């Protein structure tokens, strides 16, 4: 295990978010830093066997990823117990919490204004870039949502939470019909109907993330139950535009919610569309502009 870290090197400092995720200190985990502030994901004591398997699969999946716009795995403590999954600390947490913090009357308002158009475009491009990388690696995410995007110290947004991520190298799709605890308000109609997941169904969720950004993470299809959303979306229903939502973002959103998955854009197309409206560091860090995007 090239990913193995000595347990004595990890110190837990506080709880970040409920398996408990912790903020920790890790000594000698990153070259050139004697000690690094990290996030540490662990498994509940009462986690079912399915949950324990999925947690280990999630950690394993992360080992293959290297992208500025994807949350970095730093190491694994797997000798003895319990298993610690060590990753890049995202100083501003998840995008859903962050966005809700930016509401005018939010108790925890950080005293910074809500996102500008440029900032929303930057977020979009970063999320789409991370997803383009994921897709090129032949994985489908399956749970793309603001709550699973993370915000760095410099407000860079990165894809996280790979709990539902599946390898699609052989066929370009993952199919799982049946009953599950599922992110219904984020799911494509063909996923709901046929149980099929593809990069195009991740694109539907991307549309919902855009909607989250411009609504400051309102709940999608508010007033509708889970079972009504299921019916509504399968029947060709989609979300209405948020108040004062910029037209350019609306246009994108609608393209993401084409009923026919074949008609939705790809993640490379999203980045390409936005590429001239981004911070100058973007081509230095993006998968899009990288030699790997071949």
């Amino acid at each position: 295990d090239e990913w193995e870290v000595s347990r004595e090197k990890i110190t837990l400092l506080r709880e970040l978010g409920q398996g408990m995720v912790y903020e920790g200190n890790a000594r000698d985990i990153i070259k050139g830093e004697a000690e690094t502030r990290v996030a540490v994901k662990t498994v509940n004591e009462s986690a079912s066997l399915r949950e324990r398997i999925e947690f280990l699969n999630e950690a394993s999946v992360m080992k293959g990823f290297t992208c500025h716009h994807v949350v970095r795995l730093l190491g694994v403590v797997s000798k003895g117990q319990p298993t610690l999954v060590v990753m890049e600390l995202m100083a501003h947490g998840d995008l859903k919490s962050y966005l809700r913090s930016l509401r005018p009357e939010a108790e925890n308002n950080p005293g910074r204004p809500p996102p500008t158009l440029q900032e929303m475009i930057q977020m979009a491009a970063e999320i789409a870039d991370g997803m383009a990388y994921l897709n090129a690696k032949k994985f489908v995410h399956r749970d793309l949502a603001a709550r699973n995007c993370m915000v760095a110290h410099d407000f860079t947004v990165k894809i996280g939470d790979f709990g539902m991520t599946r390898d699609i190298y052989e066929t370009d799709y993952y199919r799982k019909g049946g009953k599950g605890l599922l992110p219904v308000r984020w799911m494509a109609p063909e996923s709901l109907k046929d149980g099929v997941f593809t990069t195009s169904s991740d694109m539907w969720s991307f549309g919902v993330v855009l909607w989250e950004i411009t609504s400051l993470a309102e709940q999608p299809y508010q007033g509708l139950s889970n079972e009504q959303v299921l019916k509504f979306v399968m029947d060709g229903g989609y979300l209405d535009q948020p108040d004062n939502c910029p037209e350019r973002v609306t246009d994108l959103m609608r393209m993401c919610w084409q009923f026919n998955p074949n008609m939705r854009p790809t993640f490379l197309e999203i980045v390409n569309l936005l590429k001239d409206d981004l911070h100058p560091s973007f081509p230095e860090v993006s998968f899009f502009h990288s030699e790997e995007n071949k």
Partner: peptide, 12 residues
Amino acid sequence: PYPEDYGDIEIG
């Protein structure tokens, strides 16, 4: 967290 962001439904 956001447990309300998931519900028990059937797909497929």
